[PDB]
Amino acid sequence: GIKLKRLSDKPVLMPKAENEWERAAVFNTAAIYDNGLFHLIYRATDIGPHAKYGKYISRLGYAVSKDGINFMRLDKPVMSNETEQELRGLEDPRIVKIDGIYYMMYTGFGDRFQDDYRICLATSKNLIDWERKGVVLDEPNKDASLFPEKINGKYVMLHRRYPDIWIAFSDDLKNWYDHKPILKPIPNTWESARVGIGGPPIKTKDGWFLIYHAADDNNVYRLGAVLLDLEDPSKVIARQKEPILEPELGWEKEGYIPNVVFSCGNAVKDDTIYVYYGGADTVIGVAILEMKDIKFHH
Amino acid sequence: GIKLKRLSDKPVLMPKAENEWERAAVFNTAAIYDNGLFHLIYRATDIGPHAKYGKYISRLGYAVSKDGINFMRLDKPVMSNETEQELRGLEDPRIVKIDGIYYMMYTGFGDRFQDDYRICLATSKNLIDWERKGVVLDEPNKDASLFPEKINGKYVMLHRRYPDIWIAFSDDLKNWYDHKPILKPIPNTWESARVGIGGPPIKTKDGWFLIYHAADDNNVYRLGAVLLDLEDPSKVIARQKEPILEPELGWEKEGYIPNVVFSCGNAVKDDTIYVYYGGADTVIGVAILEMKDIKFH
Ligand SMILES: OC[C@H]1O[C@@H](O[C@@H]2[C@H](O[C@@H]3[C@H](O[C@H]4[C@@H](O)[C@H](O)[C@@H](CO)O[C@H]4O)O[C@H](CO)[C@@H](O)[C@@H]3O)O[C@H](CO)[C@@H](O)[C@@H]2O)[C@@H](O)[C@@H](O)[C@@H]1O
Ligand SMILES: OC[C@H]1O[C@@H](O[C@@H]2[C@H](O[C@H]3[C@@H](O)[C@H](O)[C@@H](CO)O[C@H]3O)O[C@H](CO)[C@@H](O)[C@@H]2O)[C@@H](O)[C@@H](O)[C@@H]1O
Numbered sequence: 199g200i201k202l203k204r205l206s207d208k209p210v211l212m213p214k215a216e217n218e219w220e221r222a223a224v225f226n227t228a229a230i231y232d233n234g235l236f237h238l239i240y241r242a243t244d245i246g247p248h249a250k251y252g253k254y255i256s257r258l259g260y261a262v263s264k265d266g267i268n269f270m271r272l273d274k275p276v277m278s279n280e281t282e283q284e285l286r287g288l289e290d291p292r293i294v295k296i297d298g299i300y301y302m303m304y305t306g307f308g309d310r311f312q313d314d315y316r317i318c319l320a321t322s323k324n325l326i327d328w329e330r331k332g333v334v335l336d337e338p339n340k341d342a343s344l345f346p347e348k349i350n351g352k353y354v355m356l357h358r359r360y361p362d363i364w365i366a367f368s369d370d371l372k373n374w375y376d377h378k379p380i381l382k383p384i385p386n387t388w389e390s391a392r393v394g395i396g397g398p399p400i401k402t403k404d405g406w407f408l409i410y411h412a413a414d415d416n417n418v419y420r421l422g423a424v425l426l427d428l429e430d431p432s433k434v435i436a437r438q439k440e441p442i443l444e445p446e447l448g449w450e451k452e453g454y455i456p457n458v459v460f461s462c463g464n465a466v467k468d469d470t471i472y473v474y475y476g477g478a479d480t481v482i483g484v485a486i487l488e489m490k491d492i493k494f495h496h
Numbered sequence: 497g498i499k500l501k502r503l504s505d506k507p508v509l510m511p512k513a514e515n516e517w518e519r520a521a522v523f524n525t526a527a528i529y530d531n532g533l534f535h536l537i538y539r540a541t542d543i544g545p546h547a548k549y550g551k552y553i554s555r556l557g558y559a560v561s562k563d564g565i566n567f568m569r570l571d572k573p574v575m576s577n578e579t580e581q582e583l584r585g586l587e588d589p590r591i592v593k594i595d596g597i598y599y600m601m602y603t604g605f606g607d608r609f610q611d612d613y614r615i616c617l618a619t620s621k622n623l624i625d626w627e628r629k630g631v632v633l634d635e636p637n638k639d640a641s642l643f644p645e646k647i648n649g650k651y652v653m654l655h656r657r658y659p660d661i662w663i664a665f666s667d668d669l670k671n672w673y674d675h676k677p678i679l680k681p682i683p684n685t686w687e688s689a690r691v692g693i694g695g696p697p698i699k700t701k702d703g704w705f706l707i708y709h710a711a712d713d714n715n716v717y718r719l720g721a722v723l724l725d726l727e728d729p730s731k732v733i734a735r736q737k738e739p740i741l742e743p744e745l746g747w748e749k750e751g752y753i754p755n756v757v758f759s760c761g762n763a764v765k766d767d768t769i770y771v772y773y774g775g776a777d778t779v780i781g782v783a784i785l786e787m788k789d790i791k792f793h
Contacts, residue, residue: 270570324531
């Protein structure tokens with residue numbers, strides 16, 4: 199079945215000692231192909247991203263590439279910790295573009311009380327200047343994105359009421375309705391502990407192609423794939439049994455958080471999907487999948 | 497008359513010692529407002545830009561800003577020294593946008609023989625990925641730009657056959673015709689030694705507003721202003737006698753090349769012109785002019 203193919207045995211982006219805001223880790227990046235270029239909005243921390251290392255703050259950087267492998271990067275974050283909901287920063291952005299506007303959903307980590315993390319929304323026309331729209335769902339939640347277009351006149355979002363992937367609908371992005379779970383962990387497998395989306399889903403002629411992540415009972419993170427019905431994305435057409443990507447290389451297995459591959463971004467150019475992923479919550483790699491190779495076992 | 501007003505008493509961009517390609521100087525930048533942002537394509541050198549320091553190489557960097565004062569910058573040049581005409585790099589870019597395409601004219605400095613510098617053209621849709629189109633005029637020349645639109649069906653360019661500003665016309669950017677001088681130095685003034693354009697001209701209801709630079713007989717560089725006729729830009733309607741900008745601050749007067757202000761870029765947002773300029777061939781500053789204040793005596 200479906201296996202992602204690494205474009206490089208080295209990371210495509212790494213932390214930068216000279217800049218405090220991204221000195222420790224760059225990971226879990228949004229990705230989009232636009233106007234002839236691959237664009238990354240990447241999560242970056244000043245400290246290793248676990249409480250055992252310290253009070254890490256996540257900020258969002260910008261990088262750009264012609265080929266999807268070799269990146270140039272801006273020296274300052276395009277979004278920084280500004281609100282109370284963002285006391286400990288902004289995490290794990292997912293971006294789609296609808297009618298000339300980029301919609302980014304990210305985790306605002308406050309850590310003022312138990313489960314003080316919230317899905318937040320920001321919009322942009324240019325990926326540099328972001329306007330905050332506030333909390334999307336006022337509840338402990340993350341792993342969220344819009345679908346890249348309206349379905350039957352409505353905005354559609356994926357979210358993650360622990361430990362399951364959920365879907366919901368909205369007329370205006372302000373109020374959400376028709377919440378329902380669509381994907382759950384499976385006991386005694388690689389995907390037993392929890393599930394959550396990767397990057398935003400991608401429209402194909404056979405359905406919505408959605409990459410997801412899961413953790414096993416040792417907290418090893420891997421990626422998998424599902425296909426959702428076009429008109430009712432709450433309906434799962436197919437779910438591949440085996441992972442599409444697992445920690446294999448040294449920088450996937452070792453880092454601040456061991457044995458993690460984790461995606462928040464899948465850019466598309468000429469029928470090739472470029473899946474960007476965090477390795478060990480420390481660096482960013484890329485792996486590809488050609489659209490024609492999206493096949494689920496009949 | 498017309499005076500540019502500095503937005504800051506500090507530079508808006510400075511060299512960055514940790515990157516070789518822009519370690520010593522950033523200056524003489526293109527500038528354009530697009531999609532809610534100010535964009536700079538800046539000239540950068542690895543060492544002080546004078547022969548006494550060595551064989552400096554110029555490369556082109558990218559910077560971006562919401563407000564036109566505070567910039568973020570990419571870590572690598574968007575264009576580097578690649579051809580024989582660019583042995584010593586790429587200098588002094590001027591950019592305009594026509595029908596979704598950015599046209600950048602820059603100096604390719606080869607230094608293989610006397611006067612081995614040529615106006616070259618590159619195009620982009622995104623300001624990051626540039627496609628070389630080659631030499632524009634095969635002759636010693638610089639200080640060049642397209643006009644930001646076609647006039648009577650034709651591309652129009654400014655150039656500088658030393659020491660005068662010239663104009664020329666083209667159907668296709670490949671062959672040029674109707675070369676004519678439009679602006680010359682004036683003896684016993686601040687603009688006695690030579691003249692050349694600043695950034696691309698800006699369309700006004702009264703004519704084409706063109707910032708130019710000049711050097712005096714001590715090689716002090718200042719900016720001035722002219723107005724050209726809309727339909728025949730070879731015709732000068734007005735020329736201000738006094739400069740619009742001169743070296744005054746420490747980082748304009750002192751640096752690798754003393755007493756220089758030099759512009760290759762003027763971005764426009766909501767009827768305000770943002771004139772970016774090199775100071776002392778070392779750093780970049782910005783000064784503004786509101787359209788309503790464009791008045792000639
Ligand atoms: O520094 C002010 C601006 O100078 C021009 O570009 C520089 C250079 O100009 C040529 C010539 O250069 C002299 C001397 O002025 C210069 O300091 C040294 C540097 O090693 O070389 C000398 O030959 O000066 C003439 C008088 O204006 C000028 O017409 C010549 O083109 O040209 C080289 C190659 O193109 C360039 O690297 C230098 O920067 C301007 O075009 C701006 O670039 C400078 O701001
Ligand atoms: O969004 C805030 C932080 O959430 C984290 O995930 C938590 C929770 O984290 C656990 C550990 O798995 C984690 O390594 C350490 C880091 O200090 O904190 C613990 O509380 O794990 C559950 C299950 O996956 C999530 O539902 C929670 O959101 C990480 O994602 C951090 O990166 C993030 O800053």
